[PDB]
Ligand binder design. Sequence first.
Ligand SMILES: *[C@@H]1O[C@H](CO[C@@H]2O[C@@H](C)[C@@H](O)[C@@H](O)[C@@H]2O)[C@@H](O[C@@H]2O[C@H](CO)[C@@H](O)[C@H](O)[C@H]2NC(C)=O)[C@H](O)[C@H]1NC(C)=O
Ligand SMILES: *[C@@H]1O[C@H](CO[C@@H]2O[C@@H](C)[C@@H](O)[C@@H](O)[C@@H]2O)[C@@H](O[C@@H]2O[C@H](CO)[C@@H](O)[C@H](O)[C@H]2NC(C)=O)[C@H](O)[C@H]1NC(C)=O
Ligand SMILES: CC(=O)N[C@H]1[C@H]([C@H](O)[C@H](O)CO)O[C@@](O[C@@H]2[C@@H](O)[C@H](O)O[C@H](CO)[C@@H]2O)(C(=O)O)C[C@@H]1O
Ligand SMILES: *[C@@H]1O[C@H](CO)[C@@H](O[C@@H]2O[C@H](CO)[C@@H](O)[C@H](O)[C@H]2NC(C)=O)[C@H](O)[C@H]1NC(C)=O
Ligand SMILES: O=C(C[n+]1ccccc1)NNCc1cc(C(O)O)nc(-c2ccccc2)n1
Ligand SMILES: [Cl-]
Ligand SMILES: [Cl-]
Ligand SMILES: [Cl-]
Ligand SMILES: [Cl-]
Ligand SMILES: [Cl-]
Ligand SMILES: [Cl-]
Ligand SMILES: [Cl-]
Ligand SMILES: [Cl-]
Ligand SMILES: [Cl-]
Ligand SMILES: [Cl-]
Ligand SMILES: [Cl-]
Ligand SMILES: [Cl-]
Ligand SMILES: [Cl-]
Ligand SMILES: [Cl-]
Ligand SMILES: [Cl-]
Ligand SMILES: [Cl-]
Ligand SMILES: [Cl-]
Ligand SMILES: [Cl-]
Ligand SMILES: [Cl-]
Ligand SMILES: [Cl-]
Ligand SMILES: [Cl-]
Ligand SMILES: [Cl-]
Ligand SMILES: [Cl-]
Ligand SMILES: [Cl-]
Ligand SMILES: [Cl-]
Ligand SMILES: [Cl-]
Ligand SMILES: [Cl-]
Ligand SMILES: [Cl-]
Ligand SMILES: [Cl-]
Ligand SMILES: [Cl-]
Ligand SMILES: [Cl-]
Ligand SMILES: [Mg+2]
Ligand SMILES: [Mg+2]
Ligand SMILES: [Mg+2]
Ligand SMILES: [Mg+2]
Ligand SMILES: [Mg+2]
Ligand SMILES: [Mg+2]
Ligand SMILES: [Mg+2]
Ligand SMILES: [Mg+2]
Ligand SMILES: [Mg+2]
Ligand SMILES: [Mg+2]
Ligand SMILES: [Mg+2]
Ligand SMILES: [Mg+2]
Ligand SMILES: [Mg+2]
Ligand SMILES: [Mg+2]
Ligand SMILES: [Zn+2]
Ligand SMILES: [Zn+2]
Ligand SMILES: [Zn+2]
Ligand SMILES: [Zn+2]
Ligand SMILES: [Zn+2]
Lengths: 535, 533
Amino acid sequence: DAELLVTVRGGRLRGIRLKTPGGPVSAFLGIPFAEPPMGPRRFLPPEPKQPWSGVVDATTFQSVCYQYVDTLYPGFEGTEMWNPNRELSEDCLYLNVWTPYPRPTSPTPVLVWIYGGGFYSGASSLDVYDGRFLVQAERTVLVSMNYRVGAFGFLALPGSREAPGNVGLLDQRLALQWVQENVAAFGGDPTSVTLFGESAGAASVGMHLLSPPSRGLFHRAVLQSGAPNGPWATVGMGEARRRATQLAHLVGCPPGNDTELVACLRTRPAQVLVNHEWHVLPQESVFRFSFVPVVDGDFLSDTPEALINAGDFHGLQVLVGVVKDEGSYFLVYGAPGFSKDNESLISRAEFLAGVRVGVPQVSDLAAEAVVLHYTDWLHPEDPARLREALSDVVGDHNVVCPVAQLAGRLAAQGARVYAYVFEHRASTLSWPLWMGVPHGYEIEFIFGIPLDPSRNYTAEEKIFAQRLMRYWANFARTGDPNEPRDPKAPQWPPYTAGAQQYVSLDLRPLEVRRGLRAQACAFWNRFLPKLLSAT
Amino acid sequence: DAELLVTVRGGRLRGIRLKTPGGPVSAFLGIPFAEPPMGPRRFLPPEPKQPWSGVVDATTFQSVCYQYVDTLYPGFEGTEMWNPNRELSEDCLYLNVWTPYPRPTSPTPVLVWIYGGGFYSGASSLDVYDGRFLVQAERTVLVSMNYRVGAFGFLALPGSREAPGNVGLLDQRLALQWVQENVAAFGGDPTSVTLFGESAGAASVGMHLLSPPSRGLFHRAVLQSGAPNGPWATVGMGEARRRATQLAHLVGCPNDTELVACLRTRPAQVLVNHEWHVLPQESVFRFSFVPVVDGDFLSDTPEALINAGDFHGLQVLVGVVKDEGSYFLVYGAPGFSKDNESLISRAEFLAGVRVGVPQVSDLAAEAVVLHYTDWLHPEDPARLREALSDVVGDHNVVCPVAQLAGRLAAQGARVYAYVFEHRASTLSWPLWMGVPHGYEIEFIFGIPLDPSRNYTAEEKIFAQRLMRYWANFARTGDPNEPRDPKAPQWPPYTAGAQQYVSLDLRPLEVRRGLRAQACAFWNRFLPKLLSAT
Ligand SMILES: *[C@@H]1O[C@H](CO[C@@H]2O[C@@H](C)[C@@H](O)[C@@H](O)[C@@H]2O)[C@@H](O[C@@H]2O[C@H](CO)[C@@H](O)[C@H](O)[C@H]2NC(C)=O)[C@H](O)[C@H]1NC(C)=O
Ligand SMILES: *[C@@H]1O[C@H](CO[C@@H]2O[C@@H](C)[C@@H](O)[C@@H](O)[C@@H]2O)[C@@H](O[C@@H]2O[C@H](CO)[C@@H](O)[C@H](O)[C@H]2NC(C)=O)[C@H](O)[C@H]1NC(C)=O
Ligand SMILES: CC(=O)N[C@H]1[C@H]([C@H](O)[C@H](O)CO)O[C@@](O[C@@H]2[C@@H](O)[C@H](O)O[C@H](CO)[C@@H]2O)(C(=O)O)C[C@@H]1O
Ligand SMILES: *[C@@H]1O[C@H](CO)[C@@H](O[C@@H]2O[C@H](CO)[C@@H](O)[C@H](O)[C@H]2NC(C)=O)[C@H](O)[C@H]1NC(C)=O
Ligand SMILES: O=C(C[n+]1ccccc1)NNCc1cc(C(O)O)nc(-c2ccccc2)n1
Ligand SMILES: [Cl-]
Ligand SMILES: [Cl-]
Ligand SMILES: [Cl-]
Ligand SMILES: [Cl-]
Ligand SMILES: [Cl-]
Ligand SMILES: [Cl-]
Ligand SMILES: [Cl-]
Ligand SMILES: [Cl-]
Ligand SMILES: [Cl-]
Ligand SMILES: [Cl-]
Ligand SMILES: [Cl-]
Ligand SMILES: [Cl-]
Ligand SMILES: [Cl-]
Ligand SMILES: [Cl-]
Ligand SMILES: [Cl-]
Ligand SMILES: [Cl-]
Ligand SMILES: [Cl-]
Ligand SMILES: [Cl-]
Ligand SMILES: [Cl-]
Ligand SMILES: [Cl-]
Ligand SMILES: [Cl-]
Ligand SMILES: [Cl-]
Ligand SMILES: [Cl-]
Ligand SMILES: [Cl-]
Ligand SMILES: [Cl-]
Ligand SMILES: [Cl-]
Ligand SMILES: [Cl-]
Ligand SMILES: [Cl-]
Ligand SMILES: [Cl-]
Ligand SMILES: [Cl-]
Ligand SMILES: [Cl-]
Ligand SMILES: [Mg+2]
Ligand SMILES: [Mg+2]
Ligand SMILES: [Mg+2]
Ligand SMILES: [Mg+2]
Ligand SMILES: [Mg+2]
Ligand SMILES: [Mg+2]
Ligand SMILES: [Mg+2]
Ligand SMILES: [Mg+2]
Ligand SMILES: [Mg+2]
Ligand SMILES: [Mg+2]
Ligand SMILES: [Mg+2]
Ligand SMILES: [Mg+2]
Ligand SMILES: [Mg+2]
Ligand SMILES: [Mg+2]
Ligand SMILES: [Zn+2]
Ligand SMILES: [Zn+2]
Ligand SMILES: [Zn+2]
Ligand SMILES: [Zn+2]
Ligand SMILES: [Zn+2]
């Protein structure tokens, strides 16, 4: 096959033809887009890859950036599907290009995927991110990249030149630049690049909206279950510094006491850092991750809540959404009395405790605010309800309301915004019933995984996934997911700050609903901040 | 006939026969129970009436205690019905007694009614308190008395022998003492006396529950749409002196013995005409002269008493109407009136929140506003109207009543709760007000049975039912019929299950939680808010 030998600005590539049941797709895997960030380059922003001679074996996936590996449920499908699926290395700055089998003769739009995993984990090599199905069925180019996570991507000593912070975001930016110079080689259009990501990926997309040097590297944006204004997505310079120096003391970094500091971190082996990374966190918590983007004033000019309020958003098109049960997955990772194996029927006492790990580091009074605002004062002792109630607390505080805040403020300032709630449970789904439609289980449907001859998805689901892939494809093509000029009754209307319409994505045709937990998010976006400042 | 001549401890009375569609009834109206609290005895606790020669003309209602007479809607039934229907007088400490025409040979239980009216108005002679239908139908004895209101009842310079506070409450207690000693002359049993009262009447009942010297004059309590722990029913010592001292400056009065001496020199009418001028801000369910926490009557704040009280051996019947708030909005909330639809703007609504929960922080009022704003329809006027009607209803009546009920029940009382949900076919208020505060009273008293008032045949049955609930409770402390399992049962209210019944023309219906979710904000969070701010 001739379509498998392509040349980018840095040298020659050898690709691999992939099979799908609809027809083939040609793909390039593990293209090196940066110089490997190793030894003295650890913690330093990425440097573009020096051009090479020969051909690059771009036929398999490259390594996974060093990260924590979840040991909670050994060999359990639900946890393991996210665990690294390649070898770990700090040599991990590589990206992947899928493109329709006969390379499109006309410039087609490009979809860049950014994986999530709370900025401490994840990898473009994961099976649920296989782009062959999206690219085969909607003939668009797809690109995904690896980026440094955990300390390797976000340990920061604000103001140091040695751990400048946000190097994982620069990793992403570099890749987007690569897309600008090189996607034209694969039939893609550098003037039609649409970013999409889930969890911290969605937060990542968000900060690219809010950082000017990225704003000319794409044109549309899809944020799935994540937002840059999340309570978990950013950290102040003072905290960043404190957390970083803690890791150094926690790993033994003794006798300027700031450039000396990072050299010692630069000697410790990668695993030893990963080991002590979760101890750095301020208080016991869930949905909180040690090393995240810092608000330094370089990459993030101000807090995201500030940058959203007065941004440059007119003409932007944004697709935005959540799953139905955004909190339940995190509850088994810290809330007392929670397992995937029992019904998680907690007590009042356990519910109260879980509130203070769900909403960590707020005043005692603000904790009471939540506790009273989420109890069902008619059935306050009911374990079933207390469970689901804490699920709402965690889901609302971290995902739903920060996303809802983002949607209205963009729409206010003249972004064309479309919003969904994914509310369909995969028949395959391995997590227990009480977790509902959990964080991250819209992804496989967006990527058309139900078309895989291997897996055991349903007839009903095959068509559903094709419907989702079209929505996302229509979006990346045109800034509007709506089936272009369709008299068929379902019609997905844009999200305004007033009416606040969104669609329900499930096996039934789109329902148009008003208000993304409107009453609940009034508490979190409007009232709660007043408590926090005024007491 | 010789059944209308009765001799109580202090002399002879001559009463009157009242005709009822079901038979006649003997009444004794205007029985003096206290030496007239005049001249030097103004603001002083009542003195027991000394015995008299001859026979007292007990054949018509005595005078109404001096008070503000409402003139918001002059000539309108909805307001005139609460206004004085007798002459105003400081010579007003009388009581009334209804009793079955064949005077009961067996000692029969006593209902004692205490009227309401914000502790500033009211009279036992009002037509919706006519006791004749109760006794004729359920064959009980009904007693009502007047008690001083306004400054005459509750002006206090706490401490001073001269204006010690709460004499209106002591007025009530003295009349109960009269009941203990004299009810038996009319057929009544002094060992089954049930207190019931509405609005400030209900708060009074609550305060007798918490005042040890009163808690031997009755055995059961019925609180309708009011509670002693409400935000309007008591003031602090410092605040009450602050108000009494202002009224004295308003009226031209230059030391505390001095001050009260000068106030005693003023025509009663002159005081009345400055009463509202004394309140400390624009308000909509607040009154100038109310019970005070002196230490004598209430040995501590009403809430403090409830929390630490033991109530084993008490049965309490308790309830609210469907829309407690709507009535008070036309008395100062911006944009309301009985005569249009009262579709308020949002800004009208945010201003209404400040007058409806007055004297709380900015943050506090904010909290109220994001708890009562519907954030999918933040500017719908109709929704904004019913929100305000909830804000003042919940904060002033419902959540205080529910909070008292959970405590009494959890601490040894047997409690029964209702929500009154019927709108009289004759109601003169506009429709948006719903079931307004005070408009179950006619049904409790069986007024639909008066042939002249034009109620429904259905509506008459409804009132009989209610009367039987109330008599039954007075008789035995259980509103249910004893020999009727199959009758729709009214179960006791408890702190967890929180069951009440709905009184309307549908048969008993059981619901959970008296605005349980709303009331958590009021009874549980907002306190913690004003504390840590
Ligand atoms: C539901 O499960 C949790 C998890 O407890 C255990 O986790 C495994 C490691 C194993 O030991 C299993 O037996 C359990 O599923 C329960 O919470 C724990 O309960 C134990 C004793 O009851 C206690 O020592 C732990 O501290 C608890 N964990 C906390 C508080 O985070 C929970 O009680 C289970 N609910 C049931 C069985 O109804
Ligand atoms: C609804 O009515 C209120 C109250 O006004 C009374 O009833 C009206 C039918 C009208 O005839 C008024 O004169 C009555 O006094 C309206 O609010 C009033 O508006 C006037 C305008 O100058 C103002 O001076 C008053 O202070 C207002 N009253 C209050 C209590 O704020 C209101 O505008 C009417 N309309 C709506 C839509 O609510
Ligand atoms: C050191 C730091 O905090 N930021 C860097 C960053 C890095 O060089 C990184 O490699 C970005 O991928 O780059 C910054 O400015 C850039 C230019 O150096 C580049 O030639 O063109 C870019 C166009 O998007 C961009 O303007 C940045 O992104 O802020 C600045 C700084 O050197
Ligand atoms: C306020 O001043 C009055 C004066 O009118 C004080 O009343 C005194 O009472 C005694 C009898 O106990 C009499 O001799 C006079 O009436 C008054 N004496 C004087 C010297 O004024 C009253 O005690 C004062 N009130 C206080 C201090 O609370
Ligand atoms: O309860 C009533 C009548 N009733 C009595 C018993 C049961 C049911 C109803 N009537 N309530 C008047 C009221 C309330 C308020 C408000 O402040 O509470 N204000 C005023 C007012 C009067 C003159 C000048 C200014 C204000 N009148
Ligand atoms: Cl390579
Ligand atoms: Cl080094
Ligand atoms: Cl190799
Ligand atoms: Cl083509
Ligand atoms: Cl743009
Ligand atoms: Cl923020
Ligand atoms: Cl800080
Ligand atoms: Cl800071
Ligand atoms: Cl240094
Ligand atoms: Cl290493
Ligand atoms: Cl356009
Ligand atoms: Cl939802
Ligand atoms: Cl329960
Ligand atoms: Cl429910
Ligand atoms: Cl379709
Ligand atoms: Cl809807
Ligand atoms: Cl909603
Ligand atoms: Cl008559
Ligand atoms: Cl006389
Ligand atoms: Cl005589
Ligand atoms: Cl008899
Ligand atoms: Cl006494
Ligand atoms: Cl109180
Ligand atoms: Cl006070
Ligand atoms: Cl005058
Ligand atoms: Cl006036
Ligand atoms: Cl507002
Ligand atoms: Cl303030
Ligand atoms: Cl009992
Ligand atoms: Cl009829
Ligand atoms: Cl409720
Ligand atoms: Mg900080
Ligand atoms: Mg710093
Ligand atoms: Mg140490
Ligand atoms: Mg604190
Ligand atoms: Mg509790
Ligand atoms: Mg799956
Ligand atoms: Mg909601
Ligand atoms: Mg006596
Ligand atoms: Mg004070
Ligand atoms: Mg003056
Ligand atoms: Mg607003
Ligand atoms: Mg309560
Ligand atoms: Mg009427
Ligand atoms: Mg019973
Ligand atoms: Zn995940
Ligand atoms: Zn609340
Ligand atoms: Zn525009
Ligand atoms: Zn004057
Ligand atoms: Zn609230």
